[PDB]
Amino acid sequence: KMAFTLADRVTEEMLADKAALVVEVVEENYHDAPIVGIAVVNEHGRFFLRPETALADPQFVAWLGDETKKKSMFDSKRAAVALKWKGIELCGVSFDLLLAAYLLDPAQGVDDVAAAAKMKQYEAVRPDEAVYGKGAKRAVPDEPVLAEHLVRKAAAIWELERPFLDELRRNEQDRLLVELEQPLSSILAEMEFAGVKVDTKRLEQMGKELAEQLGTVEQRIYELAGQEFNINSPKQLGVILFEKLQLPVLKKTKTGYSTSADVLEKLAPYHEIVENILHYRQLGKLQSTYIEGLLKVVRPATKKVHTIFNQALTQTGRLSSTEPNLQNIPIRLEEGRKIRQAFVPSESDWLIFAADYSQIELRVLAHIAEDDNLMEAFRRDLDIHTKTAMDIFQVSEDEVTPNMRRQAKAVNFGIVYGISDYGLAQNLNISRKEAAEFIERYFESFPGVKRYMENIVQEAKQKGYVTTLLHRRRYLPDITSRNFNVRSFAERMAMNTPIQGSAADIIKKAMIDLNARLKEERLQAHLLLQVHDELILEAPKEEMERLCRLVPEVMEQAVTLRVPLKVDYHYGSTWYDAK
DNA sequence: CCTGACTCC
DNA sequence: ATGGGAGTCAGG
Ligand SMILES: Nc1ccn([C@H]2C[C@H](O)[C@@H](COP(=O)(O)OP(=O)(O)OP(=O)(O)O)O2)c(=O)n1
Ligand SMILES: Nc1ccn([C@H]2C[C@H](O)[C@@H](COP(=O)(O)OP(=O)(O)OP(=O)(O)O)O2)c(=O)n1
Ligand SMILES: [Mg+2]
């Protein structure tokens, strides 16, 4: 039973200095998406406004953009970006219920106001999907039904703010929300709306050449197989490998023979065709995802792509990137890495600038574990990825290739995060006995890491959750399970989540600090992407010198640990050349 | 619609 | 049974 005004025009009482605000965008991808309705709840009452009315009203636009007029919202980034596409600036967001719910418990997967409301037994609001429908049936409902929904969402935010803030405070997470996540949200909104420019001429030419290449590789595979088949079907491929060619079956899953890359690599001594197939599947992913998939989402008039950074999704505090994912662009193989040549500055005589934290989760672990040897390694500015490489490959520091260092990187993180002898052995294609002895020596080098991992598992059993440096939390209710697999996975989340999450806390803080410095120094430079422990910027070529000092400094000083933080940086004419 | 493939941190 | 965190794709 909820009264509200379906307003025909904006009135002064709608423009109070505190309000719950709903700016509704139904489409999952909110870039250039319709705003279908607006709701405002404040001390004076409850109001629904039509966007064509409200958004062309100069007082309402003024109010949206006035930082002293405070708004509580759910997913303020979605509203901010949708408004930027409407040419309107949103300021003064003081509470975001999505971010509040996320910090209280990321496992709730809260994706609408109703699911957040449930956390406090508030039920005077419906789920979005129940209002709009799903798939081909998704639609905006009749105005009265829409209006009531948006108003109930705003009223929920109005009533839920204090109970959420109260609980965050009890958890010592209120500052994490107000000083970190909420300011980051506005920064991500800027990055997403800016977008990254793409060289479509180059990408399309790449794609044409790649198609010819796939054809050649495909026919070679059919020749080796003695038959045509769909190489992109693990079922058909399994029949070829394990029935026609009679190769050993190393692994099965629930649907049939495994053809994972791990398995095919191990079959190379039996038939050369597995190497061709691995190459083919790489090339096919390049074409489907990083050529075709990317071209499909380029906005043609500006040649820009606009990702969405999901800030309330991952269980550790990382961001994710969708439609397109710009956090998994190829780099490890030169063939794939060339895609990066198609990511270019948005203005002429600008350049791309990239900065990456050195050995980040190993520095974080040194600090949190207080491992004397590892802490001293970072004080000696050593490279643990390179050192591990020299060992596993029996090679000098000068003969270690970037590829070797990449592999050693997975060995280091594998070991500290609980890899077994079976897994390490399968990884380095070495003897299981050899792998076990290697793990043993690793923890004899870093015994504090070992103690830390034993202890954090016990603490997680006792408390039911683990925490990061800035008080981010993950609950682990499975960790005392009688079941071995269920318990074991939970134990390994206790080992990993605090470290990966603390690293996420750090780069989030650096983005805030960096933008503040950019503004203070009046630089045109701005952030384009975050890639977990990297920041990618564009700026006039004349700003590179400054950035070379400023960016790494801000990143390195974002937090003070018991070890130095270190940042590598590069710049060039394209994302590829920023190395 | 899921599974298993390739991509990154 | 067998490091952890992610997203997109073709095939079925
Ligand atoms: N009410 C609070 C207090 C702290 N924090 C988060 C953000 C802070 O940046 C981080 C660190 O807190 P402090 O700097 O105040 O140090 P603490 O006293 O909390 O010690 P510790 O972090 O070891 O628990 O914790 C928070 O979100 N809300
Ligand atoms: N196989 C991997 C690779 C990375 N990561 C995590 C831990 C890494 O510290 C972090 C960053 O990825 P990087 O590739 O940037 O690795 P580093 O920062 O550790 O090393 P560097 O930047 O010096 O190459 O992501 C991981 O858990 N497992
Ligand atoms: Mg790094």
XYZ file of C-alpha atoms (C1' of nucleotides) in Angstrom, chain A residues 251-252 418-423 432 483-489 491-492, chain C residues 1-4:
22
model
C 41.457 -38.051 -19.128
C 37.682 -38.152 -19.323
C 47.994 -24.985 -2.639
C 48.828 -26.934 -5.806
C 49.401 -30.644 -5.178
C 52.280 -32.765 -6.366
C 49.907 -34.282 -8.938
C 49.013 -30.865 -10.314
C 55.174 -36.634 -9.317
C 33.073 -33.767 2.502
C 36.712 -33.764 1.328
C 36.308 -32.015 -2.024
C 33.915 -29.400 -0.739
C 36.126 -28.720 2.301
C 39.344 -28.684 0.290
C 38.114 -26.123 -2.212
C 40.329 -24.256 2.345
C 42.092 -23.095 -0.825
C 40.915 -35.208 -5.969
C 44.471 -32.619 -7.048
C 46.520 -23.470 -7.233
C 42.289 -19.098 -7.587
